[PDB]
């Protein structure tokens, strides 16, 4: 972008400054008030989002809830009362929803659509006129791929 000459003081003495690692521009951008003189119209960015650990399913014949071995194995090894004080439930007591199965055919697809981009994570909405839907916006919005020429980066 186009832009929107300092004397030697007691304050900017380079004999007082320890030069160990070079300070860059992204240090000024991530922390706008620590390393910046005259920080006029900066905006405070988002800090951090927790790591979404969603793992994609490649085989439809596998069950929807499965120990996918990208997950690391858990290492294996309390006031438990005795069996003599016999607690007995009434006969009509059941666990909840025992007739329904644990997973169906639409379970893994329903979980995979929960982490879909807009509007594929939705199930209802309004229509949009066809010239207001960019199809290229993510592609130049993400980053530049490696090995591209100069003019494509520009």
């Amino acid at each position: 972008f186009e832009p929107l000459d300092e004397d030697w003081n007691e304050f900017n003495d380079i004999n007082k400054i320890i030069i160990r690692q070079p300070i860059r521009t992204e240090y000024k951008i991530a922390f706008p008030y620590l390393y910046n003189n005259l920080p006029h119209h900066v905006h405070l960015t988002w800090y951090h989002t927790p790591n979404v650990v969603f793992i994609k399913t490649e085989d439809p014949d596998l069950p929807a809830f499965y120990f996918d071995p990208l997950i690391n194995p858990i290492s294996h090894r309390e006031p438990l009362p005795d069996d003599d004080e016999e607690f007995e439930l009434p006969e009509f007591v059941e666990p909840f929803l025992k007739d329904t199965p644990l997973y169906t055919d639409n379970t893994a697809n329903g979980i995979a659509l929960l982490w879909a981009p807009r509007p594929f994570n939705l199930r209802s909405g309004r229509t949009r006129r066809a010239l207001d839907i960019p199809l290229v916006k993510n592609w130049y919005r993400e980053h530049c791929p490696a090995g591209q020429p100069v003019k494509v980066r520009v």
């Binding site: 490649e58 071995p69 993510n138 592609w139 490696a146 100069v150 003019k151 980066r153």
Partner: protein, 90 residues
């Protein structure tokens, strides 16, 4: 055209030229760039983690799934070039 003097990211840093892009558990893919070419240019590290941590029957499951995928590819290709095709099938 745009001039080469308008370019950015001309930075002589070992950390920023090799920015070390992600491959995302060997499951995520960069959109549009060819999927077979993306499987060729991968780090080929998570495949070792698979074949170490899959179950002994799951290697046969992976092989059977790849055979089903190659069967679908052979049903798909049955779009060749005319230099390797016959006359009755053209």
């Amino acid at each position: 055209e745009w001039d080469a003097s308008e370019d950015t990211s001309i930075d002589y840093n070992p950390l920023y030229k090799e920015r070390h892009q992600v491959q995302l558990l060997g499951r995520g893919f960069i959109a549009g760039i060819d999927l077979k070419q993306q499987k060729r240019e991968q780090s080929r590290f998570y495949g070792d983690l698979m074949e170490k941590r899959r179950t002994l029957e799951e290697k046969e499951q992976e092989e059977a799934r790849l055979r089903k995928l190659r069967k679908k590819e052979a049903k798909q290709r049955w779009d060749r070039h005319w230099s390797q095709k016959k006359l009755d099938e053209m």
